[PDB]
Ligand binder design. Structure first.
Ligand code: SF4
Length: 184
């Protein structure tokens, strides 16, 4: 827990290793203090996969959902705590839910307005992808290549390109582990 914990998953150091879908889910969680079912699962299970303990997860999710009076701790405990515990098996269900790979994520129903699950390389506009990638210090040429992949429907290749351009068999947790190790 000294490395991956409820507080460190909000740090720049750890979050620099997230792929765009996880970055998007964290941003929606930060802005809205809530995520709908599909994004709640995609993000909760990705964090379980990178080693966030069950105890630190309940800290992370309860703090994020109750921020700025968005809901009382009571409402969190009555309406969400069970669902988050179930993702770790804490309520006695003997299923160890596995993190979603890219194919699984792309296969979920496409996000609509207010949703943050899915794959930004498919689900975002070029304008929104361009700005996000500019903010990650990518150049014009580099962004055009990434978008070429997006236009061909080759989302996991576009993601791989972004990994390659931001560092000096398709799975968000694999992106995280590969990026974290280059960070060490
Ligand atoms: S390709 Fe996979 S890891 Fe990359 S942004 Fe899309 S769903 Fe996430």
């Amino acid at each position: 827990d000294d490395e991956i914990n409820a507080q460190s998953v909000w740090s720049e150091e750890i979050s620099s290793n997230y792929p765009l879908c996880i970055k998007n889910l964290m941003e929606g969680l930060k802005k809205n203090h809530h995520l709908r079912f599909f994004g709640r699962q995609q993000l909760s299970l990705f964090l379980k996969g990178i080693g966030l303990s069950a105890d630190e997860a309940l800290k992370f999710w309860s703090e994020a959902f109750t921020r700025n009076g968005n809901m009382t701790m009571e409402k969190f405990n009555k309406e969400f705590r069970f669902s988050f515990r179930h993702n770790y098996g804490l309520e006695g269900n003997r299923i160890n839910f596995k993190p979603w790979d890219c194919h699984t994520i792309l296969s979920k129903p496409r996000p609509g307005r207010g949703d943050f699950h899915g794959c930004p390389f498919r689900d975002w506009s070029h304008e929104r992808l361009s700005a996000e990638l500019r903010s990650m210090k990518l150049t014009q040429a580099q962004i055009i290549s990434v978008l070429d992949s997006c236009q061909k429907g080759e989302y996991t290749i576009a993601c791989t390109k972004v990994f390659e351009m931001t560092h000096n068999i398709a799975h968000p947790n694999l992106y995280f582990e590969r990026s974290r190790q280059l960070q060490k």
